[PDB]
Amino acid sequence: YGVALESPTGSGKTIMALKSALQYSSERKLKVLYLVRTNSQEEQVIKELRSLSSTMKIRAIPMQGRVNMCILYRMVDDLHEINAESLAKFCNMKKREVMAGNEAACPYFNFKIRSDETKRFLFDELPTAEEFYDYGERNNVCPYESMKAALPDADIVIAPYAYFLNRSVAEKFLSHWGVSRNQIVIILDEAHNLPDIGRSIGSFRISVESLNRADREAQAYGDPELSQKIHVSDLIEMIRSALQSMVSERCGKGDVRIRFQEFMEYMRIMNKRSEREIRSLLNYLYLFGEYVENEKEKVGKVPFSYCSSVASRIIAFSDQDEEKYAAILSPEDGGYMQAACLDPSGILEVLKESKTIHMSGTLDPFDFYSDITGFEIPFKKIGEIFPPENRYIAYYDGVSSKYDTLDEKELDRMATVIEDIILKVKKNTIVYFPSYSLMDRVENRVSFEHMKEYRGIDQKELYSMLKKFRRDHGTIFAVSGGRLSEGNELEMIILAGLPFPRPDAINRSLFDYYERKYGKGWEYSVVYPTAIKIRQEIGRLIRSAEDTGACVILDKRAGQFRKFIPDMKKTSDPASDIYNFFISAQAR
Ligand code: SF4
Ligand SMILES: [Ca+2]
């Protein structure tokens, strides 16, 4: 039901896909779906599809949910949480008012949704979703409805994972396409993220600021009596103080694992009631949400209720999840409790109901991906092989890690070794750190003109640095997991510390899960993901068979990763060996 392929990185990954997935494609009616995580990857796919469009016929359109593609809803209202359901009701009512006679109701709903001009743009130019949104904006035509209008005559579709893996959304999506999950083919772009996408989509949380929000909604819409003497506002106060007492009492320096029944226990003891009562009041809150939703709708607002969406998430929290999820409490962002999905096999399972094709270029040992993802498929290493002498991977002793976030002494060795390498190699380097504290500690010990990448991010200032990166000079600092992971220019990578997952309660839980299941919690929850994080930087450094680069790791326990990286070396003088490597590269 699936195939996993590995291509050496860059400009090819998605061309190879249709070149390895014209198999089936259209001889058995099938539709080609392209799932993508970030919008940055989306366009790296679409740019490829655009190139091959002149080769032979392909009719593609990007597809995304109203949550992204509805223009109106951000002007009419602006909520801090939202969902596809509420936007459905909202929009359907607007379309009613337009079709009834009030075109102003929603000025983006008109003939242009079905016009040749619009459909020409979608197929002949094949924009990204962000690009087709902009088109729609300037042309006063709804992007979403346009996509859905163009969909039934589309052979190929490029959508986010979070769109399709939303069960209720996928059903409407396919009901309009005409295709069924039998008649589909799904290409999983950068499928090395599949495990993480599952755990992400699967998880949910109830945060204090979310209760705060429902509290204001409660006051807005009557704050009626749920029980005789307990109002909506009172119930919310009960639920927030359960959470706050839990965060106060249960956790210190950060996250903590708790048991799901604990919240209800805290709920029961504090307020002197049993489950029946608390379950009921929680239900009566969801019902109030339903009232709020109806009341917002009949006015013309987006019918989204914080009390409705909170009610369900608490019910969901307290009810299921004991085996495949973990109950994490957290002090962050006022506090929240979370259902951390530890095993994404059950979320991703819906995919093997269609034919899947797992594209990456970075999932070295497949067993881990198969065991984690729960995908029992063949694995082929389809990719014309780049020579190993064109690459240089090595790890270094000096900066010996007895602790993972301590020792000023061994942090000086981190600064010096870096400074020796960059000043001597003199090439376009980016130094990934495992955290912001180590990067900030190193930067003030270091004394060379570099380029920061601190929290805040914002899309505009990311390019301002990227402009000066490609053009002149060289060095850039970044935290590994950050947004420099989304991209000639590059040449050397200095992993200033091996990018392990943080001492989370979640990562602790994941270890336990893959300890109780395979007796290898370390290999499954720490190493394999870290190896795949590394390989990715190595992969984004060398994309061509004629491109060159180096990648050092400053870590004493980096030796582990030889069986994941079969051409890694070890160094005691990395500065000189990398320089000696680059002299050998220049030669040719
Ligand atoms: S037609 Fe209007 S209400 Fe519907 S998704 Fe488009 S902008 Fe939103
Ligand atoms: Ca509802």
The full 3-state SS of 476-498, as one line of letters, equals EEEECCCHHHCCCCCCEEEECCC
- In the block, tokens 């000086």 appear at 412
Q: Locate the ligand 1 atom nearest the alpha carbon of residue 143 and give its number.
A: 6
Q: Is residue 534 located within the same domain as residue 576?
A: yes
Q: Is residue 7 located within the same domain as residue 54?
A: yes
Q: Is residue 44 located within the same domain as residue 54?
A: yes
Q: Is residue 276 located within the same domain as residue 196?
A: no
Last residue of a domain, one of 343, 375, 403: 343
Q: What is the CATH number of the domain that holds 326?
A: 1.10.275.40
Task: Enumerate the β-bridge partners of residue 359.
Answer: 5
Q: What is the CATH number of the domain that holds 7?
A: 3.40.50.300
Q: Is 149 in the pocket of ligand 1 (CB under 6 A)?
A: no
Q: Is residue 454 located within the same domain as residue 581?
A: yes
Ligand lying closest to the C-alpha of residue 287: 2
376-412: b or e for each residue (b if 16 or more CB lie within 10 Å)?
ebebeeeeeebeeebbbbbbbbbbebeeeeeeeeeee
Q: Is residue 198 located within the same domain as residue 277?
A: no
Which of 474, 512, 476 is CA-nearest to residue 326? Answer: 512
Ligand lying closest to the C-alpha of residue 308: 2
Cα–Cα separations (whole angstroms), residue 238 to 99, 245, 278, 282: 45, 11, 10, 11
**Rounded to whole angstroms, how far apart are CA atoms 76 and 228?**
36
- In the block, tokens 């223009």 appear at 71
Task: Enumerate the β-bridge partners of residue 61.
Answer: 157
According to the annotation, is 177 in a ligand binding site?
Answer: no
220-238: b or e for each residue (b if 16 or more CB lie within 10 Å)?
ebebeebeeebbbbbbbbb
| Residues 267 and 278 sit within 8 Å (Cβ to Cβ) | yes
| Size of the chain in residues | 588
Taking residue 197's Cβ as centre, other Cβ atoms within 10 Å add up to 21
- CA angle centred on 392, ends 389 and 471, rounded to 5°: 110
Which two three-digit tokens encode residue 353? 């109901």
Last residue of a domain, one of 362, 387, 412: 387
Q: What is the CATH number of the domain that holds 109?
A: 1.10.30.20
CA of 70 relative to ligand 1 center, distance in Å = 5
Nominal resolution in Å?
2.9
Q: Is residue 134 located within the same domain as residue 163?
A: no
Q: Is residue 317 located within the same domain as residue 336?
A: yes
Which of 377, 373, 312 is CA-nearest to residue 348? Answer: 373
> What is the domain range of residue 324?
204-343
Q: Is 106 in the pocket of ligand 1 (CB under 6 A)?
A: yes
- CA angle centred on 21, ends 125 and 160, rounded to 5°: 55
**Rounded to whole angstroms, how far apart are CA atoms 362 and 354?**
23
Q: Is residue 56 located within the same domain as residue 69?
A: no
**Rounded to whole angstroms, how far apart are CA atoms 574 and 417?**
8
CB burial of residue 146 (10 Å; 0-12, 13-18, 19+): buried
Given ligand 1 and candidates 64, 67, 73, which is best to mutate, with the most ligand atoms within 8 Å of its CB?
A: 73
Across the beta sheet with 256-258, the strand order is 204-207, 336-341, 325-330, 256-258
CA of 102 relative to ligand 2 center, distance in Å = 26
After which residues does a break in the chain occur, C–N more than 2.5 Å?
Answer: 487
**CB-based contacts of 579, cutoff 8 Å, min separation 6:** 424, 425
Task: Say how many domains are in the chain.
Answer: 4
CB burial of residue 54 (10 Å; 0-12, 13-18, 19+): exposed
Given ligand 1 and candidates 83, 97, 137, 145, which is best to mutate, with the most ligand atoms within 8 Å of its CB?
A: 145
E runs forming strands in 146-278: 156-160, 184-188, 204-207, 256-258
Which two three-digit tokens encode residue 293? 């939703």
Q: Is residue 141 located within the same domain as residue 185?
A: no
Which of 248, 449, 265 is CA-nearest to residue 331? Answer: 248
The full 3-state SS of 30-61, as one line of letters, equals CEEEEEECCHHHHHHHHHHHHHHHCCCCCCEE
Across the beta sheet with 429-433, the strand order is 476-479, 429-433, 492-495, 549-554, 391-396, 569-571
Q: Is residue 402 located within the same domain as residue 548?
A: yes
Q: Ramachandran region of residue 206, left (φ > 0), alpha (ψ -120 to 50) or beta?
A: beta
Q: Is residue 308 located within the same domain as residue 376?
A: no
**CB-based contacts of 52, cutoff 8 Å, min separation 6:** 15, 18, 58
CA of 293 relative to ligand 2 center, distance in Å = 7
Taking residue 251's Cβ as centre, other Cβ atoms within 10 Å add up to 18
According to the annotation, is 341 in a ligand binding site?
Answer: no
Last residue of a domain, one of 97, 114, 145: 145
